[PDB]
Amino acid sequence: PISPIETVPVKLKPGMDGPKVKQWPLTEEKIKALVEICTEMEKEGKISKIGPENPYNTPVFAIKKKDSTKWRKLVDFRELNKRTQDFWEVQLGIPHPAGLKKKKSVTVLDVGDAYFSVPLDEDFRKYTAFTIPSINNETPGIRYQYNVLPQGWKGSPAIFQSSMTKILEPFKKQNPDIVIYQYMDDLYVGSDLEIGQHRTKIEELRQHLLRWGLTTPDKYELHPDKWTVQPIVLPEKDSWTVNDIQKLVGKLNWASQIYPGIKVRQLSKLLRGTKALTEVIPLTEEAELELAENREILKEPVHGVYYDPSKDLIAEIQKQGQGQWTYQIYQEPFKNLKTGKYARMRGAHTNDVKQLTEAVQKITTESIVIWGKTPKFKLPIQKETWETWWTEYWQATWIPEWEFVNTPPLVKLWY
Amino acid sequence: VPISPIETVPVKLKPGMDGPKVKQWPLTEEKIKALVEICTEMEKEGKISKIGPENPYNTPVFAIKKKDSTKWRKLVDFRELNKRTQDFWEVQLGIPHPAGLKKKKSVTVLDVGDAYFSVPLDEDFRKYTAFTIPSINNETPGIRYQYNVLPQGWKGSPAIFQSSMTKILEPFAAQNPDIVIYQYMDDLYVGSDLEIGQHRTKIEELRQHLLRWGLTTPDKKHQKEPPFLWMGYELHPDKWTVQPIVLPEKDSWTVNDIQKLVGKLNWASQIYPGIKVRQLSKLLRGTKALTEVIPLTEEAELELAENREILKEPVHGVYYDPSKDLIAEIQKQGQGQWTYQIYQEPFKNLKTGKYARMRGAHTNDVKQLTEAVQKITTESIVIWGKTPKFKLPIQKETWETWWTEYWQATWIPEWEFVNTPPLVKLWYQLEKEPIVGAETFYVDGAANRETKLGKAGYVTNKGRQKVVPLTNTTNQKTELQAIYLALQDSGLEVNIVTDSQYALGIIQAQPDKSESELVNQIIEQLIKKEKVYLAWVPAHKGIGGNEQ
Numbered sequence A: 001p002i003s004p005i006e007t008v009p010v011k012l013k014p015g016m017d018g019p020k021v022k023q024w025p026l027t028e029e030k031i032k033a034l035v036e037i038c039t040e041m042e043k044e045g046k047i048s049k050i051g052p053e054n055p056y057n058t059p060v061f062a063i064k065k066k067d068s069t070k071w072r073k074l075v076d077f078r079e080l081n082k083r084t085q086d087f088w089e090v091q092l093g094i095p096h097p098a099g100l101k102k103k104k105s106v107t108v109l110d111v112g113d114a115y116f117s118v119p120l121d122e123d124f125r126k127y128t129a130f131t132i133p134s135i136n137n138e139t140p141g142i143r144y145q146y147n148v149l150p151q152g153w154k155g156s157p158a159i160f161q162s163s164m165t166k167i168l169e170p171f172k173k174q175n176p177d178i179v180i181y182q183y184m185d186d187l188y189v190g191s192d193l194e195i196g197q198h199r200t201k202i203e204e205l206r207q208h209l210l211r212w213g214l215t216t217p218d219k220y221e222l223h224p225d226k227w228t229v230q231p232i233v234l235p236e237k238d239s240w241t242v243n244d245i246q247k248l249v250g251k252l253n254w255a256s257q258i259y260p261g262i263k264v265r266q267l268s269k270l271l272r273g274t275k276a277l278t279e280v281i282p283l284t285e286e287a288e289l290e291l292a293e294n295r296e297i298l299k300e301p302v303h304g305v306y307y308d309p310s311k312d313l314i315a316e317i318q319k320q321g322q323g324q325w326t327y328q329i330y331q332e333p334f335k336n337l338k339t340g341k342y343a344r345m346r347g348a349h350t351n352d353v354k355q356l357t358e359a360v361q362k363i364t365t366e367s368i369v370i371w372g373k374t375p376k377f378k379l380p381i382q383k384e385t386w387e388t389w390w391t392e393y394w395q396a397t398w399i400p401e402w403e404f405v406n407t408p409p410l411v412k413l414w415y
Numbered sequence B: 001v002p003i004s005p006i007e008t009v010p011v012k013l014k015p016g017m018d019g020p021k022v023k024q025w026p027l028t029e030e031k032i033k034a035l036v037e038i039c040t041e042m043e044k045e046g047k048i049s050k051i052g053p054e055n056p057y058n059t060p061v062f063a064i065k066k067k068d069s070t071k072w073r074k075l076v077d078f079r080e081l082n083k084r085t086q087d088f089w090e091v092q093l094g095i096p097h098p099a100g101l102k103k104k105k106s107v108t109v110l111d112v113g114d115a116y117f118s119v120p121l122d123e124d125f126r127k128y129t130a131f132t133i134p135s136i137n138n139e140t141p142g143i144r145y146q147y148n149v150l151p152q153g154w155k156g157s158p159a160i161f162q163s164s165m166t167k168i169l170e171p172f173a174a175q176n177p178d179i180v181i182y183q184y185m186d187d188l189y190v191g192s193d194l195e196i197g198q199h200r201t202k203i204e205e206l207r208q209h210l211l212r213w214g215l216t217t218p219d220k221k222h223q224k225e226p227p228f229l230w231m232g233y234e235l236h237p238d239k240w241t242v243q244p245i246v247l248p249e250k251d252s253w254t255v256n257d258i259q260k261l262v263g264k265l266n267w268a269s270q271i272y273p274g275i276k277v278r279q280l281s282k283l284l285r286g287t288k289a290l291t292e293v294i295p296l297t298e299e300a301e302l303e304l305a306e307n308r309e310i311l312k313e314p315v316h317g318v319y320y321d322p323s324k325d326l327i328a329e330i331q332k333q334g335q336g337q338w339t340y341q342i343y344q345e346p347f348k349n350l351k352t353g354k355y356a357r358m359r360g361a362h363t364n365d366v367k368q369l370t371e372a373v374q375k376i377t378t379e380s381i382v383i384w385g386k387t388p389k390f391k392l393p394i395q396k397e398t399w400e401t402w403w404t405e406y407w408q409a410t411w412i413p414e415w416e417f418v419n420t421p422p423l424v425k426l427w428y429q430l431e432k433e434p435i436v437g438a439e440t441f442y443v444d445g446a447a448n449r450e451t452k453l454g455k456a457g458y459v460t461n462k463g464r465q466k467v468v469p470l471t472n473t474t475n476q477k478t479e480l481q482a483i484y485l486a487l488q489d490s491g492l493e494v495n496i497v498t499d500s501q502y503a504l505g506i507i508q509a510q511p512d513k514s515e516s517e518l519v520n521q522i523i524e525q526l527i528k529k530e531k532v533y534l535a536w537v538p539a540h541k542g543i544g545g546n547e548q
């Protein structure tokens, strides 16, 4: 390898020190995998061993590449990211193509390897320090720091941005209608082409990047034009009971925090007496009319809801049972930028944690394609459980921010 | 004079700072003349060096005396320097657990003397370690010094010494991969399956290698023989246990003493099964005064008595064999306390432990069991680097029902059912749909925040109405009280309708126990009922759900 230019100097925000984060305990399997991977990486000059005079640490995990039988090392750079990249969202910050979500097909390619041929600033290397843990704290961990641009660090594509633009320039000339956006280790490519044409063009880009020196072990298609804010659905019933009208009035009353132009009164007058829950109550004209008015007002989106770039994105997920999960991406309460429902194959494959994980990945990817940044999740799972099992089913190269919720949503079936 | 040709670790001062300028005059002539004697001998060994005072720095130097005063000891307070020095990598946060150690035919403990003083200090940093011995009154020129090696009490000493020791062991471990060396503070712990003769030969070889680098090791045999008392553990050749625990007898207990007691019991719980800290720690709920005398309750003394009866006879843990399965077994103690044993063998425990739920007002057995399984999974991953097969006192139907209808996503690995009671079951289940042919109770409750009087009542579809007055209550408590009333006055199958999202939230969580007596009574009622359908409606929207 060679240094194409000198190393791009990297500074943090003045007053901010390097990341210091504990290394999560790992299975012997994953530890051995990381040991092999890092032995080879040390052999190739990508990383070097460090002494006690380096205080900083960043977590490391072992996952599967995609479906692959070979282990892949996933570094969690979220802290270092937050420290450097908020300045590198400014100085080297990559612009987001808001027209990407309009394309009928979007394919994701993994360009990460590109970063490994580029050296890292000598003064900055000490902040890339990570630790391969030992079982039962028997030995102090094995400590490395990166000699080259690390994967998972948002500064890496920022530094490689010029080279990427240069390499992509010929392809973008022959294909002016194709949108290409680089988020961290991944390249998102949109088109309006037929699936066959789209895949052929993606393969063209693969061979183009390959003959220019960029290996992409992609050897996964979205459709963002169908992505929107889902309408709230009122139950369609031939007849009704007292209980049903109660659920209806309740749900609508909850929806009033969203669409203030909803009136539940005429439905309230129909239950007026004190009745058994199972008593069938036929709808009147003044009632049914109100039901129709509240139905037609619920299919039209909200007024005054826009995306604030100064505010973080928040993704809430709730479990619907039977392999179904519902989610909302918002910023301020009750103003929803996005809503959706993730589903999976039913039985003898997936469990709860797997489904939630894949859901989080899907939501995160959507958020990347749309707003150019990832949401902070509120996860319906026990903290330690998730922290233990999240690396099993994780196929993504990035890590979204997350926290954990108690006090179960009664919304539930309402969404 | 064991000089060390060891590569030094480069050290910096925190950016913007400089060396400590603290000056020390005091005090006594005797201590001064005692300092000279030691400093000359340290200089002879090259550990320190005199310096011409060209704008140097300074650090306070005291002198103290151990028991058996034939030997003086010099002390240096590096606090001010330690503030200004750069941060270093943490040395060792946690310690290895004996249950995770593996059987070795021979084990040797080697403690290295003059550990820090045998490891050189970075040259350019040495000037920051400068200190002065005071002249005897008379404002006379003092004796300047600085450290050429790792000073005791200096921030960077333990980590630098650790890494230096590691690099020193590096060429030796390469020639002897069959032997395993652990490194803790000033101690090395070697072990091997080699025969005693070859083992001792290798130990002596290691001692010689270490001595070549300027690190001394014990001459007579090698030091201690098993035990092996280490970090509050007793390590035997074929077994491990905890150092003897002493539970003091007192006529009066204080927060401090209860802290020590709960500490000892917790520490003992890793091996002796059955230890219960719940009541004794519940005594400690008040965080206010540390010296406050706290009266023990009856449940607390009972619990402590059971703990004494458990601690009567000694028990031991075994070591880990990778070739055999890892099994975890959990039992409920009934108070919200759970106990567990981890074993590769039926009569032999690797270790034991307990899980208690401190957080939350209400919960159920299945959830607590899940949390326990979580804790054991984490602990197992830490200690043995894998996860155990679980033997659990819960039917697959109960578990599956619970996690299928649970709002939160849990998980448990492959597990097998154990019929040993008390079994974990679902004591009641709410109906998912309203009950035809069941009386419908519309319940409500209210309270005045000031007077705290309030009332709770119901009105049914059969025209039955009741209002019961309350005292010293709150809105939530009346909201639960109304539902309790409806449960009391109805048949085996009942439809309740509440205006309370609170009460609905508590009940829908299906708790089998709570720290509230009211919730417990409601639980009992829900158990006694054949069918209960609880439903919610918006409060003060006036449909069928009006006030009282």
Ligand SMILES: N#C/C=C/c1cc(Cl)cc(Oc2ccccc2OCCn2ccc(=O)[nH]c2=O)c1
Pocket: B096, B101, B102, B103, B104, B105, B106, B107, B108, B109, B180, B181, B182, B189, B190, B191, B192, B226, B228, B229, B230, B235, B236, B237, B238, B319
């Ligand atoms: N002071 C003091 C000594 C403390 C000490 C601390 C640790 Cl972490 C390990 C240790 O012994 C070992 C050293 C190297 C490998 C395995 C070991 O243990 C294996 C288990 N074992 C324990 C005692 C015994 O006699 N035989 C035996 O097989 C000793």
